[PDB]
Design a protein around this nucleic acid. Structure first.
Ligand SMILES: [Mg+2]
Ligand SMILES: [Mg+2]
Ligand SMILES: [Mg+2]
Ligand SMILES: [Mg+2]
Ligand SMILES: [Mg+2]
Ligand SMILES: [Mg+2]
Ligand SMILES: [Mg+2]
Ligand SMILES: [Mg+2]
Ligand SMILES: [Mg+2]
Ligand SMILES: [Mg+2]
Ligand SMILES: [Mg+2]
Ligand SMILES: [Mg+2]
Ligand SMILES: [Mg+2]
Ligand SMILES: [Mg+2]
Ligand SMILES: [Mg+2]
Ligand SMILES: [Mg+2]
Ligand SMILES: [Mg+2]
Ligand SMILES: [Mg+2]
Ligand SMILES: [Mg+2]
Ligand SMILES: [Mg+2]
Ligand SMILES: [Mg+2]
Ligand SMILES: [Mg+2]
Ligand SMILES: [Mg+2]
Ligand SMILES: [Mg+2]
Ligand SMILES: [Mg+2]
Ligand SMILES: [Mg+2]
Ligand SMILES: [Mg+2]
Ligand SMILES: [Mg+2]
Ligand SMILES: [Mg+2]
Ligand SMILES: [Zn+2]
Lengths: 150, 234, 208, 138
RNA sequence: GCGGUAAUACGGAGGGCGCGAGCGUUACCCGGAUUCACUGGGCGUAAAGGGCGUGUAGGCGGCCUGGGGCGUCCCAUGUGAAAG
RNA sequence: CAAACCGGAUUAGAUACCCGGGUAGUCCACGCCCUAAACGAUGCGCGCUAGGUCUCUGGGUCUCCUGGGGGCCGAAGCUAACGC
């Protein structure tokens, strides 16, 4: 079925009179490794709970990735807020040459040869969100044909 | 079914609190007030009713939302007149998107509809029979016609897409087709199947919503005489 | 051979049997059977999520300890396969697998690579009938790897090709059990190699 | 006075599409015209036309979008997602036939003026010419 | 960033990791640094709009036609030693 | 009217805040100085991209249209956010 990776876990803090109160965030990707991935942000009281909850959220908002032989149809850059991911396609053998955050995402979609650059801020939450918006934006020769056609 | 080249009340409403996206459906600004293109009301009316028809033919349910007081009754009757859920009082946030939870508020209503029968509703404290007969009448208040839904609706019939504009959002996010009685102060784009008309003066909200169910139960085999409020609208 | 030292502690650390010694690694006596945890004091304590980095390291070591190559020797092989034309993961294996020391192992002249590295530095091995005493010599295809005429009967190589009577040798090698000849037919293909290692991971490690 | 009129048109377009207009007037010039011809051929615009907004000549450009979508925000997909000036005044940009851009692995064009006329990236490659890289569209 | 009497951060020990006739240190150069940004950044509050004008040189320059062909593009050709 | 200054108070102290005086200065002419939270902390120019509304000032068929200017709310959009 779906594999899950979990790109990051964090421990946030809120202020209470006498003492500060905690919680945990969990970024997780899920993918089938043949063209579907989803990114989940799961915040909650206990770690394994928010990991689990993140998984669930990630199964909404999937992206269908157009893998053309383990890679990308074209190249995009996406700026998500102050982060910027740059995806560039590659020929077989190249492997996923990418950060840790976008490797997790890309790998679970099935991309097996890609070039990648993180630019702007490096906040993994945003970089992930951007990697995803990148995959979301990939068109293929076929979709582009449908668009222009009259 | 149409009421063709006819304008008994259909047309223009709203002054200059419009939305310029709605400008394709405007004929003129007849003395401080836009007038809805009589044609295009009928033009949309055709396509949309065909959807409403075809969907009820397949058996699915339509959620009627109408919170504004001008239609706060026309909604309840015409929706009881078919096997459809209505939302009449106020639109609870989450009724759509948090259905699995706003549902199990009905599993307390139906559980308390019958709970007025048991031999121990006179036994077990009288101070706790008070919040369990007033609560019941609050669930009967809001979840009046929401109880009919046992699962998400297939389409949703909104009177003022701008007043009950949360319900338009909620459908949208769950991918439920938005039908609406849209009028000048509303975004045409957020409506999948629009009826460009009016959502006040009661006359127009009856003529449209009545005809709505006329095509519904026509497709539910039945085909009945007017059973509504043609005079009960004054 | 090279490295030199307790070997089964490596079998143990990589959590996989690596077979760094021929016989015995088929007995119920390789430590991995009935002692399969890492070596040392904290062998049996539970583990922690090894980092991304950690994973790539071990996966490399696993490969690299399988062949008994050094690392400057190994890195050079991978670097060459990198520059080289073709797919760099699979090609790397082919270069490893083309080393005389290992080709001798494969043809079952030696029971393991460590022993095969000896048989070579000690000139018991011929390539195209001329003594090659270099364990890292690269055997191209067509070449014929023999046992040296005047070696052709030590207590060891006799008993070692005795077992090779009726055993099968890789698709990419033909062997002659009689004259103790044997041939390198083609650079082994990735699929041929049943290596307990994801060679891909290894590529990630070297591009850190 | 518009400093760059090719860019004002590329933009006028971009601004129109982004709010899903029907069409839009750009003031007339053979060159601008010469370009839109290409946009049409490759399907980025339905068409252009030589209308005449009050006395002086314009080019009504008619826009083409996607179909309506389902979800929150139905607004259709642009056919022209991206359209940018490459060579601008005070930084002209000429490429030889050997270094004409491959735009989006070819799911998009680049428009260049050459001595053989205004051509696409694939058009100039056949004809074997370079020129002044005017804009990419994809 | 560790050490303020239970230190996986100091010193020793056992154990482990990495390389191995080498292993470390220091020094220096490019990299990561889109951190001088042509590719490839910025200036309301993070550093950054000149106190405002007038205007010199300079940069930039609407629509149509024709000449030249300086930029630009194309073909052929000469040159681009050896080593690397 | 008021830096400095001279007194009176207040205070632990009071070179201060409060009180009574008080010169330069604040004023005018002419000549310097050239600074600033010289602020919209937002260079100038031109084109394009929903609308509502309040206001100053023109014009036309003056319930309304059409300019120039000053505010507010807001479409798309932008922004680290605030916000624009
Ligand atoms: Mg930015
Ligand atoms: Mg930074
Ligand atoms: Mg209304
Ligand atoms: Mg101690
Ligand atoms: Mg302590
Ligand atoms: Mg210690
Ligand atoms: Mg340390
Ligand atoms: Mg640099
Ligand atoms: Mg910067
Ligand atoms: Mg500043
Ligand atoms: Mg200024
Ligand atoms: Mg200043
Ligand atoms: Mg000048
Ligand atoms: Mg010019
Ligand atoms: Mg000039
Ligand atoms: Mg000429
Ligand atoms: Mg010339
Ligand atoms: Mg040379
Ligand atoms: Mg005084
Ligand atoms: Mg005084
Ligand atoms: Mg003066
Ligand atoms: Mg000055
Ligand atoms: Mg402007
Ligand atoms: Mg007047
Ligand atoms: Mg104004
Ligand atoms: Mg003013
Ligand atoms: Mg917005
Ligand atoms: Mg900006
Ligand atoms: Mg915002
Ligand atoms: Zn072993």
């Amino acid at each position: 079925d779906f594999e899950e990776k979990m790109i990051l876990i964090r421990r946030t803090a809120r202020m209470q009179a006498g003492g500060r109160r905690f919680r945990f965030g969990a970024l997780v990707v899920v993918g089938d490794r043949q063209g579907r991935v989803g990114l989940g942000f799961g915040k909650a009281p206990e770690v394994p709970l928010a990991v689990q909850k993140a998984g669930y959220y990630a199964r909404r908002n999937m992206v269908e990735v157009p893998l053309q032989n383990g890679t990308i149809p074209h190249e995009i850059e996406v700026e998500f807020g102050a982060s910027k991911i740059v995806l560039k396609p590659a020929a077989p053998g190249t492997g996923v040459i990418a950060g840790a955050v976008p490797r997790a995402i890309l790998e679970l979609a099935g991309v097996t040869d890609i070039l990648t650059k993180e630019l702007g801020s490096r906040n993994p939450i945003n970089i992930a969100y951007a990697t995803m918006e990148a995959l979301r934006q990939l068109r293929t020769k076929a979709d582009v044909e449908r668009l222009r056609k009259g | 079914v149409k009421e063709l080249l006819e304008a008994g009340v259909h047309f223009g409403h709203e002054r200059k609190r419009w939305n310029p996206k709605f400008a394709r459906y405007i004929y003129a600004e007849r003395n401080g007030i836009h007038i809805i293109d009589l044609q295009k009301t009928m033009e949309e009316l055709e396509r949309t009713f065909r959807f409403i028809e075809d969907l009820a033919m397949r058996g699915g349910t339509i959620l009627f939302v109408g919170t504004k007081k001008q239609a706060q009754d026309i909604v309840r009757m015409e929706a009881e007149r078919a096997g459809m859920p209505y939302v009449n009082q106020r639109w609870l946030g989450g009724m759509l998107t948090n259905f699995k939870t706003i549902s199990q508020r009905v599993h307390r209503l139906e559980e308390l509809e019958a709970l007025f029968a048991s031999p121990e509703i006179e036994e077990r404290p009288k101070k706790e029979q008070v919040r369990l007969k007033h609560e019941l009448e609050r669930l009967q208040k809001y979840l009046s016609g929401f109880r009919l839904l046992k699962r998400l609706p297939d389409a949703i019939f909104v009177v003022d897409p701008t007043k009950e504009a949360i319900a338009v959002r909620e459908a949208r996010k769950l991918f439920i087709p938005v039908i609406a009685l849209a009028d000048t102060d509303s975004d045409p784009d957020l409506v999948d199947y629009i009826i460009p008309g009016n959502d006040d003066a009661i006359r127009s909200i009856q003529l449209i919503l009545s005809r709505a169910v006329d095509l519904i139960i026509q497709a539910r085999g039945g085909v009945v005489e007017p059973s509504p409020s043609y005079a009960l609208v004054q | 051979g090279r490295y030199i030292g307790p070997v089964c502690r490596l079998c143990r650390r990589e959590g996989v049997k690596l077979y760094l010694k021929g016989e015995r690694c088929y007995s119920p006596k390789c430590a991995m059977e009935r002692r399969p945890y890492p070596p040392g004091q904290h062998g049996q304590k539970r583990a922690r999520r090894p980092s991304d980095y950690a994973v790539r390291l071990r996966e490399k070591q696993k490969l690299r300890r399988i062949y008994g190559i050094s690392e400057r020797q190994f890195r050079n092989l991978f670097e060459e396969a990198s520059k080289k034309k073709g797919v760099t993961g699979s090609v790397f294996l082919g270069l490893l697998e083309s080393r005389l020391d290992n080709v001798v192992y494969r043809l079952g002249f030696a029971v393991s690579r460590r022993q095969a590295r000896q048989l070579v530095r000690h000139g018991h091995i011929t390539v195209n009938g001329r003594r090659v005493d270099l364990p890292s010599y690269r055997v191209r295809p067509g070449d014929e790897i023999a046992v040296a005429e005047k070696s052709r009967n030590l207590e060891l190589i006799r008993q070692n090709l005795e077992a090779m009577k009726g055993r099968k040798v890789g698709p990419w090698l033909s062997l002659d059990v009689e004259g103790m000849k044997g041939k390198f037919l083609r650079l082994p293909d990735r699929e041929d190699l049943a290596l307990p290692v994801n060679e891909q991971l290894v590529i990630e490690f070297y591009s850190r | 006075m518009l400093t760059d009129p090719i860019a004002d048109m590329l933009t006028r377009i971009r601004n129109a599409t982004r709010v899903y207009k029907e069409s839009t007037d750009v003031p007339a010039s053979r060159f601008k015209e010469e370009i839109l011809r290409i946009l049409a051929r490759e399907g980025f615009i339905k068409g252009y036309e030589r209308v005449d907004v009050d006395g002086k000549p314009y080019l009504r450009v008619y826009l083409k979008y996607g179909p309506r979508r389902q979800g929150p925000d139905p607004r259709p997909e642009q056919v022209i997602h991206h359209i940018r000036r490459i060579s601008k005044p005070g930084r002209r940009v000429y490429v030889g036939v050997k270094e004409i851009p491959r735009v989006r692995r070819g799911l998009g064009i680049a428009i260049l003026s050459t001595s053989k006329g205004v051509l696409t990236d694939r058009e100039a490659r056949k004809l074997g010419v370079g020129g002044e890289l005017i804009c990419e569209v994809w």
